[PDB]
Amino acid sequence: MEEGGRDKAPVQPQQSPAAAPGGTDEKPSGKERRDAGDKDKEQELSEEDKQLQDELEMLVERLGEKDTSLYRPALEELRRQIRSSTTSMTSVPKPLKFLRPHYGKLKEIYENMAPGENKRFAADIISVLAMTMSGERECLKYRLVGSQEELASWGHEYVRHLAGEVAKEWQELDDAEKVQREPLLTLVKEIVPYNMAHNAEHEACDLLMEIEQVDMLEKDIDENAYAKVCLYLTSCVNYVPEPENSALLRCALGVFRKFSRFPEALRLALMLNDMELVEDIFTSCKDVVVQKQMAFMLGRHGVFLELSEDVEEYEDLTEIMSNVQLNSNFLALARELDIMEPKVPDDIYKTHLENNRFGGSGSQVDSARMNLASSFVNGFVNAAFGQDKLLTDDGNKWLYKNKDHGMLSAAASLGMILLWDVDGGLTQIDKYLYSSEDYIKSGALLACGIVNSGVRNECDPALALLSDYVLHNSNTMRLGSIFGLGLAYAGSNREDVLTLLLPVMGDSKSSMEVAGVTALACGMIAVGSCNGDVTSTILQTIMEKSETELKDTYARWLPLGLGLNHLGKGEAIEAILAALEVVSEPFRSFANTLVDVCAYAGSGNVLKVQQLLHICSEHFDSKEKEEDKDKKEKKDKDKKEAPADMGAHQGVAVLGIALIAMGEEIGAEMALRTFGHLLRYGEPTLRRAVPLALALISVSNPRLNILDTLSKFSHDADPEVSYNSIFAMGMVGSGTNNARLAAMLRQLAQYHAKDPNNLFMVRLAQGLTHLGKGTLTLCPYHSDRQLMSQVAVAGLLTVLVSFLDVRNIILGKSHYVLYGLVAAMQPRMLVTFDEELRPLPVSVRVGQAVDVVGQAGKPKTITGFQTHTTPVLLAHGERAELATEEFLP
Amino acid sequence: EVPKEKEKEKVSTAVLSITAKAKKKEKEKEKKEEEKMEVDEAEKKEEKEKKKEPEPNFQLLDNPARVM
Amino acid sequence: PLVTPHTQCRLKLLKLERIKDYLLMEEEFIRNQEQMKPLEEKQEEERSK
């Protein structure tokens, strides 16, 4: 301990501020010049950030705190210069003069008068002088002012431009990772008036830099991955004009302002769709801006590009609408017959060959309901041009043999055989159409809507299936005709055929399953306007469901189209609309949780997730509202599948422990459909946690509840090694887990993982994270499986052809105009880089190296090299344009 | 002779988080909806205090009158 | 295992508060689970003897 002898600064700045009350009065020079000699020297012993220990700043205030309490207030005759010497010298040590209740008094030295241009003695120092202290002001002092009194005094007026120059100072001194400290400053200051802060910070960023935009640009969208309702409403529209005004990267408009379509205003992204039609230079970014506008996140854009430039600049519209759709058919025609696939594999059924010697002999299984699953050896493998003449003879015999619902099912499988087709898809049906039967034509003409699904061109808006519908005096002609056309025009929000198919609801012909899928057919069409659909559904709901207390054919189908007509907005007006509209008995207030959370597809709104638990948690509920706690858990399944894995680990942690562990009817009947809704990628955490409750069948219940959890355990696409689980459970599933009920089911689970080789993207995440619904086509099936008796009769309309929004697969094609380029692409396990050293290595799995149409996989941001510049949108999206430039030798 | 009819009925949701400023801006939403369309409800005080003070201590009693 | 800012940024202040939200709710849901159980049969006489 070598103290003493060199303690100059603990003596003379211990004495001269102690002599400052001894020299304020009767010493006009010593009041001023010793203050200025104190001020610059204390300023100089802080500017190097290589002596944090300052020989004054924690040496003078031991008496100087009681001094400043008697020097600044008690002088009472403060001059115009001596306030600029006192407050410039004594507002510096006040974060360390004072303890944690400094937060109310960062002003009793400073805001007496802020001396001039306080960064004048705080420019080259990063945060030790006042910039940490400036964040201490905006944390607590501005928030209590700007809680209800934003428009206020000097604590707002100068504080605006004070925070303005400080936010310039973060990107001024060193331009380090304190760029991201500016959104740390801009959002803590005036949390709800963020745009009033950001509007000055938009224009300041526009003149800040054009190279130091992009990491702050991704900092915003990382903060926009989850927020409050109003913060996600605010900072996402602040996110919009920064590649519009500062830079013109601008190919991140269409999908990354589909981010901002539903929250802020539907017309606002349509004004950004107008901003697409402003920046028409030249074609290449314009091409891939409008590639996504048809079948990547929405359709319904084919009405705004038939204006005055219909030569090539507005004749991309039909090219977008069906020709690049058919060029995507040329992927599955040309490229995917080249990689793997002849016309009929037909041998996953043949992969059940070694079972006949496992335990003696075989040929014991003769169940007639297995022949339902026999259609999927032909059915699922023949998607994307698995066209079959006389390979449908297993269909052709069984169509003309028995099983009326399988006559509808085998006829509905023909639409899956010719999918995404307009050229000759109806010609395939017509030879298998004229059998003059109810079940054959109702499955085939429903499959005609599946053939032209995603086309939305002129095939039959009211031609075929409207003529099929007006044939009705009877069975599924009444039913199966409205379903296929609303499936085909689900991407559109056309009003006309919605009003053609609204007298289906207004007929009051009391076929119950027809009116239920009528809500599902109109639900797939619209998500926004036409409140008269909500009027039309609840009229027959109050007519029919009020005079019953019975089955979920009422409940699983009629409120679901209401939720599909109001999907994806966290405004909480739609809950005020719907729940106050059907104020009713609790078995009709089953519908309370539907339209509540169908508007709540994905965000962070954890306050909803607690009312998704705390109202109907358990209660033990002796067989009265057990459907509602299942459906309340059904809406826990979404709002979990897109915070991008932040709550997915928390979802599998809660729902593994809480329900299947300490539950009853909520857990052991229904709570596995989360895993059939959360992901379809597959990973051995949840893929092995389900046979913990499946190999233990727990047969005491109506075990098709647990065998429903068998079924969409294989609701993970992208074919895997999971055959080890399903075939070995199929071996114990032939004799035991009786083949009368689920011999269709286990092979439905077996044959669905290898659906084709490819085309597994059914998982509602495009580009990086945006939805692309999608949800309107899947969510009817997991609402349908509640629970039994639709394994035989009614759910066979659903279980085959429920979800049909598969968009294509792979990010391999090049499309440089003649379509001859391949690439040198380099596929890897996805990004982790958030803020690290510049530049940041995007990925980590350098081993795989392909050129052309190779796979997507679970976490793959595939990059490219060889100086082709890949300049298009720099995110990805499976129709890259790929120009050419090499000006770096 | 009441049986003390009691209710568990609730456990208080103690999630102390972003909830705190989210309920506060919801009370701001009621200051446009309540006081601008229709709220004119009122109640009166000190009716129940009035009957207490002029009380007896002059209770009249017939012949076989009990008294502590 | 996603604390990937790796620095004193508000994201790690935002990310960890999300983890606080789900574990408190997992606490309160199982707190409601042992609360609202009016089922008593205690063995239906079989395992109790």
From Swiss-Prot, chain A:
PANTHER family according to UniProt: 26S PROTEASOME NON-ATPASE REGULATORY SUBUNIT (PTHR10943), 26S PROTEASOME NON-ATPASE REGULATORY SUBUNIT 2 (PTHR10943:SF1)
Protein species of origin: Homo sapiens (Human)
Designated name of the protein: 26S proteasome non-ATPase regulatory subunit 2
Family stated for the protein in its record: Belongs to the proteasome subunit S2 family.
UniProt GO cellular component terms: cytosol; extracellular exosome; extracellular region; ficolin-1-rich granule lumen; membrane; nucleoplasm; nucleus; proteasome accessory complex
Compositional bias ranges of the Low complexity kind: 10-21
One Pfam family per UniProt: RPN1_C
N6-acetyllysine: residues bearing it: 551
Gene that encodes it: PSMD2
Any GO molecular function: enzyme regulator activity
Annotated segments matching region Disordered: 1-52, 623-645
Keyword field: Acetylation, Phosphoprotein, Proteasome, Repeat
Modified residues annotated as Phosphotyrosine in this record: 194
From Swiss-Prot, chain B:
Residue numbers bearing the Phosphothreonine modification: 13
Domain of life where this protein originates: Eukaryota
Chain segments carrying region Disordered: 22-64
Ranges annotated as biased composition (Basic and acidic residues): 25-35, 42-55
Chain positions with Phosphoserine modification: 17
Family the entry assigns: Belongs to the proteasome subunit S1 family.
Function statement: Component of the 26S proteasome, a multiprotein complex involved in the ATP-dependent degradation of ubiquitinated proteins. This complex plays a key role in the maintenance of protein homeostasis by removing misfolded or damaged proteins, which could impair cellular functions, and by removing proteins whose functions are no longer required. Therefore, the proteasome participates in numerous cellular processes, including cell cycle progression, apoptosis, or DNA damage repair.
Subunit structure: Component of the 19S proteasome regulatory particle complex. The 26S proteasome consists of a 20S core particle (CP) and two 19S regulatory subunits (RP). The regulatory particle is made of a lid composed of 9 subunits, a base containing 6 ATPases and few additional components including PSMD1. Interacts with ADRM1. Interacts with ZFAND1.
Protein name (record): 26S proteasome non-ATPase regulatory subunit 1
GN (gene name): PSMD1
From Swiss-Prot, chain C:
Domain of life (superkingdom): Eukaryota
Residue ranges with Basic and acidic residues bias: 37-49
Residues annotated as transmembrane: none
Region (Disordered) location: 35-49
Disulphide bridges, residue numbers: none
Entry-annotated residues carrying Phosphothreonine: 4
Localization (cell): Cytoplasm; Nucleus; Membrane
Disease tied to this entry: Birk-Aharoni syndrome: An autosomal recessive disorder characterized by failure to thrive, severe developmental delay, intellectual disability, spastic tetraplegia with central hypotonia, chorea, hearing loss, micropenis and undescended testes, as well as mild elevation of liver enzymes.
Oligomeric and partner information: Component of the 19S proteasome regulatory particle complex. The 26S proteasome consists of a 20S core particle (CP) and two 19S regulatory subunits (RP). The regulatory particle is made of a lid composed of 9 subunits, a base containing 6 ATPases including PSMC1 and few additional components. Interacts with SCA7. Interacts with NGLY1. Interacts with PAAF1.
Function per UniProt: Component of the 26S proteasome, a multiprotein complex involved in the ATP-dependent degradation of ubiquitinated proteins. This complex plays a key role in the maintenance of protein homeostasis by removing misfolded or damaged proteins, which could impair cellular functions, and by removing proteins whose functions are no longer required. Therefore, the proteasome participates in numerous cellular processes, including cell cycle progression, apoptosis, or DNA damage repair.
Family per record: Belongs to the AAA ATPase family.
Protein name per the record: 26S proteasome regulatory subunit 4
UniProt organism field: Homo sapiens
Gene field: PSMC1
Residues of the full protein shown: 50 to 98 of 440
